[PDB]
């Protein structure tokens, strides 16, 4: 099916929600017959500019494969969630493994 390269940052003060947030997303993916290729979390790293007067966001890479209407429910989840700033749904022809 379609390949995707999702990277979304998370509000620091909610970093203990992150392994809960991660398994929330992949349960919707593999429960809709979705392959997964990566879960490479990068931890809290320094921003280049302040996103909403704030530094040191928590970065989460997924790089998952899903049908395009299943992921269409996923970015609107990133909209209505204050703990997520700057999602980025993306794409390659052949999603891959460890890259950083």
């Amino acid at each position: 099916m379609r390949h995707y390269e999702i990277v979304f940052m998370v509000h620091p003060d909610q970093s203990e929600q992150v392994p809960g947030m991660i398994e929330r997303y992949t349960a919707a993916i593999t429960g809709a017959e979705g392959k997964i290729h990566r879960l490479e979390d990068w931890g809290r790293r320094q921003l280049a500019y302040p996103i909403n007067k704030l530094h040191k966001a928590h970065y989460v890479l997924m790089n998952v494969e899903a049908p395009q209407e299943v992921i269409d429910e996923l970015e609107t989840t990133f909209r209505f969630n204050d703990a997520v700033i700057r999602s980025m749904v993306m794409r390659t022809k052949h999603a891959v493994t460890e890259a950083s």
């Binding site: 990277v7 921003l47 280049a48 500019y49 302040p50 996103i51 970065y59 700057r86 890259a99």
Partner: protein
């Protein structure tokens, strides 16, 4: 000069920010290919890696951040 991206068969992705900071100048602007000597195909996808890294705060837009 030459293009090291054409020396290999790799792909310039936005996540490899260690090799992108020698392609921007000291104020965040992209260095032209007439200085660096990159091929025109890889220079076009290099700026697509600069612009995606600027969105995800891995690289700054200006130096006033």
């Amino acid at each position: 000069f030459c293009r090291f991206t054409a020396e290999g068969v790799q792909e310039i992705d936005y996540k490899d920010i260690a090799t992108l900071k020698n392609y921007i100048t000291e104020s965040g602007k992209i260095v032209p290919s007439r200085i660096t000597g990159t091929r025109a195909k890889y220079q076009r996808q290099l700026a697509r890696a600069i612009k995606r890294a600027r969105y995800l705060s891995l690289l700054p837009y200006t130096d006033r951040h």
